[PDB]
Design a protein around this ligand. Sequence first.
Ligand SMILES: [Ca+2]
Ligand SMILES: [Ca+2]
Length: 92
Amino acid sequence: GHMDTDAEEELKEAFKVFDKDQNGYISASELRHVMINLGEKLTDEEVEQMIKEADLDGDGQVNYEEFVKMMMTVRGGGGGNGWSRLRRKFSS
Ligand SMILES: [Ca+2]
Ligand SMILES: [Ca+2]
């Protein structure tokens, strides 16, 4: 087995869902909407903190590249408290 890839489709599919606007850029607005829909009530501070951690250019928006790398790290590497919370409530 060890085929893997389950990440490519997972990250890609999820990313496509996160970016409702489909502009290729995730914003606190979309992130917050997803968190709320998940039955979670997080404050803007938590959302902003997540963007800052992932955002390396502080453009107020997270690009696909920032998402993939961030997801790759949080997986074994570890990230902030928000990303870890999402990556924790997901698989395990
Ligand atoms: Ca967007
Ligand atoms: Ca960014």
